[PDB]
Design an enzyme around this catalytic site. Structure first.
Site, short mmCIF file in Angstrom:
data_model
loop_
_atom_site.label_atom_id
_atom_site.label_comp_id
_atom_site.label_asym_id
_atom_site.label_seq_id
_atom_site.Cartn_x
_atom_site.Cartn_y
_atom_site.Cartn_z
N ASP A 1 -2.67 19.37 -7.98
CA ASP A 1 -2.42 18.90 -6.61
C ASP A 1 -0.93 18.62 -6.40
O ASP A 1 -0.52 17.51 -6.08
CB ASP A 1 -3.24 17.63 -6.31
CG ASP A 1 -3.22 17.25 -4.83
OD1 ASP A 1 -2.77 18.07 -3.99
OD2 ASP A 1 -3.67 16.13 -4.50
N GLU B 1 -3.73 2.66 -2.61
CA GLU B 1 -4.27 2.24 -3.91
C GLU B 1 -3.19 1.89 -4.94
O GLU B 1 -3.52 1.38 -6.01
CB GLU B 1 -5.21 3.32 -4.47
CG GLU B 1 -4.54 4.55 -5.09
CD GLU B 1 -4.03 5.56 -4.07
OE1 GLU B 1 -3.96 5.24 -2.86
OE2 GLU B 1 -3.68 6.69 -4.49
N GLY C 1 0.79 -1.23 0.00
CA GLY C 1 0.00 0.00 0.00
C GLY C 1 0.82 1.28 0.00
O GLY C 1 1.27 1.74 1.05
N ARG C 2 1.04 1.85 -1.18
CA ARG C 2 1.57 3.20 -1.33
C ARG C 2 0.40 4.07 -1.75
O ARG C 2 -0.62 3.55 -2.21
CB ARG C 2 2.66 3.24 -2.39
CG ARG C 2 3.82 2.30 -2.15
CD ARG C 2 4.24 1.63 -3.45
NE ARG C 2 5.25 0.60 -3.25
CZ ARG C 2 6.50 0.70 -3.67
NH1 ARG C 2 6.88 1.78 -4.33
NH2 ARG C 2 7.37 -0.28 -3.44
N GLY C 3 0.52 5.38 -1.59
CA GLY C 3 -0.55 6.31 -1.97
C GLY C 3 -1.45 6.69 -0.80
O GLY C 3 -1.43 6.05 0.23
N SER C 4 -2.24 7.75 -0.98
CA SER C 4 -3.11 8.25 0.08
C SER C 4 -4.15 7.23 0.50
O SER C 4 -4.49 7.13 1.69
CB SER C 4 -3.82 9.53 -0.36
OG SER C 4 -2.90 10.48 -0.86
N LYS D 1 -1.90 1.68 -10.12
CA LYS D 1 -2.84 2.50 -9.38
C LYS D 1 -4.22 1.98 -9.70
O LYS D 1 -4.60 1.93 -10.86
CB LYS D 1 -2.73 3.97 -9.80
CG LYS D 1 -3.52 4.91 -8.90
CD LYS D 1 -3.95 6.19 -9.60
CE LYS D 1 -4.72 7.09 -8.65
NZ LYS D 1 -5.17 8.37 -9.29
C1 LIG Z 1 1.76 7.69 -14.49
N1 LIG Z 1 0.64 7.62 -13.60
C2 LIG Z 1 -0.33 6.58 -13.71
C3 LIG Z 1 -1.31 6.83 -12.58
C4 LIG Z 1 -0.83 8.08 -11.89
O1 LIG Z 1 -1.77 9.13 -12.09
C5 LIG Z 1 -0.52 7.87 -10.48
C6 LIG Z 1 -0.28 7.79 -9.30
C7 LIG Z 1 0.12 7.63 -7.94
C8 LIG Z 1 -0.65 8.05 -6.89
C9 LIG Z 1 -0.18 7.84 -5.61
N2 LIG Z 1 0.99 7.25 -5.32
C10 LIG Z 1 1.71 6.86 -6.38
N3 LIG Z 1 2.92 6.19 -6.17
N4 LIG Z 1 3.45 5.50 -7.19
C11 LIG Z 1 4.59 5.00 -6.70
C12 LIG Z 1 5.45 4.18 -7.51
N5 LIG Z 1 5.25 4.36 -8.86
O2 LIG Z 1 6.26 3.42 -7.01
C13 LIG Z 1 4.78 5.37 -5.35
C14 LIG Z 1 5.76 5.12 -4.42
C15 LIG Z 1 5.58 5.68 -3.19
F1 LIG Z 1 6.52 5.46 -2.26
C16 LIG Z 1 4.49 6.45 -2.86
C17 LIG Z 1 3.50 6.71 -3.79
C18 LIG Z 1 3.68 6.15 -5.03
C19 LIG Z 1 1.33 7.02 -7.69
C20 LIG Z 1 0.41 8.50 -12.59
O3 LIG Z 1 1.09 9.46 -12.27
#
Ligand SMILES: CN1C=C[C@@](O)(C#Cc2ccnc(-n3nc(C(N)=O)c4cc(F)ccc43)c2)C1=O
Length: 322
Positions: free
Chosen positions: A170, A68, A62-65, A84
């Site tokens: 955002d 998700e 679980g990464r993200g708010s 996502k």
């Molecule tokens: C290109 N693309 C496709 C879907 C998108 O709109 C998104 C997103 C998003 C939202 C929250 N969190 C993360 N998030 N992604 C990662 C990762 N890629 O490893 C990640 C890693 C973290 F440590 C925390 C949040 C993270 C990614 C977008 O931009």
């Protein structure tokens, strides 16, 4: 004329394809359809289905708010990336139409999108360095040079988006993802993304409240510059180790953003003159007086030079918040 027929060809299937196809198909998303933009994610007999063609990591984090975003693996190619999950009813088209076809190191690349029932599963590069948001909790706050270094890179990404008349909507440390060694940063999460030329109308989802601009809060029309205000709210978050306003106020931080002057008082006095002035340009209440990405990226570049470039290490010893 033939657009109608091309949309029909893409529907009902997951195919290896290209951004323009994905955007066309995505618009139909207000049983297993989608396009995969990379060789490493292959559909099987017209399908790509969770726990059949791609496995979400069984340790499960679980990464993200909204917890998700997940680590995943394509079962055939063994390629790993991030997913996502977006609820189908909530899914905003611009998230891909903005994101699709974009080639830039300051932006997280999109690897495809596939619908499966009540979900839209959006695939992207996995960044193992974590978010800038995590970096701040981890190390309390950041040194001035590091802070400018990253804001510049965020601003470099915002340039790219604004040149194509896209608003990120955002900008916030959580939405800035770092590399393994922390030398590179990129913007992610285009879930509030808009196309440009009022803001508050209908299906629109608002950004983080602490990082929200006055024109948005009041309700006046908005341009590329709303990102600039956020980017500087984020600058402050990096310097003080907490969001603006929160330290000074409790109840409704929106009405504070509108009535009160810009929170330039939250700039630590130990910052260099230019560092402080750069942030002041970015946080002027009125969009016309507020700086653009190009103007602020240039000023931020200068401020870094002025404090002797990027000296401090990427995992320096914890520093106390304000
Ligand atoms: C290109 N693309 C496709 C879907 C998108 O709109 C998104 C997103 C998003 C939202 C929250 N969190 C993360 N998030 N992604 C990662 C990762 N890629 O490893 C990640 C890693 C973290 F440590 C925390 C949040 C993270 C990614 C977008 O931009």
């Amino acid at each position: 004329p033939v657009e109608e027929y091309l949309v029909h060809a893409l529907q009902g299937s997951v195919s290896s394809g290209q951004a323009h196809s994905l955007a066309s198909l995505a618009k139909t998303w207000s049983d297993n359809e989608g396009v995969l933009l990379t060789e490493k994610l292959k559909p099987v007999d017209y399908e790509y289905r969770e726990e059949v063609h791609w496995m979400t990591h069984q340790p499960r984090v679980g990464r993200g708010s909204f917890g998700e975003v997940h680590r995943m693996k394509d079962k055939q190619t063994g390629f790993q990336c991030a997913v996502k999950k977006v609820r189908l009813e909530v899914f905003r088209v611009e998230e891909l139409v903005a994101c699709a076809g974009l080639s830039s190191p300051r932006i997280v690349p999109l690897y495809g999108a596939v619908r499966e029932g009540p979900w839209v599963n959006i695939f992207m590069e996995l960044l193992e360095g974590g978010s800038l948001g995590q970096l701040i909790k981890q190390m309390g706050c950041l040194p001035e040079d590091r802070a400018l270094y990253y804001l510049g890179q965020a601003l470099e990404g915002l340039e790219y988006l604004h040149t194509r008349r896209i608003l990120h909507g955002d900008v916030k440390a959580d939405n800035v993802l770092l590399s393994s060694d922390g030398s590179r940063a990129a913007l992610c999460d285009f879930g509030h993304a808009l196309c440009l030329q009022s803001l508050l109308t209908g299906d629109y989802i608002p950004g983080t409240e602490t990082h929200m601009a006055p024109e948005v809060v009041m309700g006046k029309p908005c341009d590329a510059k709303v990102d600039i205000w956020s980017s500087c709210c984020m600058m402050l978050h990096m310097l003080n180790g907490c969001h603006p306003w929160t330290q000074y106020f409790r109840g409704p931080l929106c009405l504070k953003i509108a009535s009160e002057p810009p929170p330039i008082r939250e700039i630590p006095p130990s910052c260099a003159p230019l560092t402080a002035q750069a942030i002041q340009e970015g946080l002027r209440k009125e969009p016309v007086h507020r700086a653009s990405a190009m103007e602020l990226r240039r000023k931020v570049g200068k401020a870094l030079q002025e404090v002797g470039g990027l000296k401090s290490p990427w995992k320096g010893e914890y520093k106390e918040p304000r």
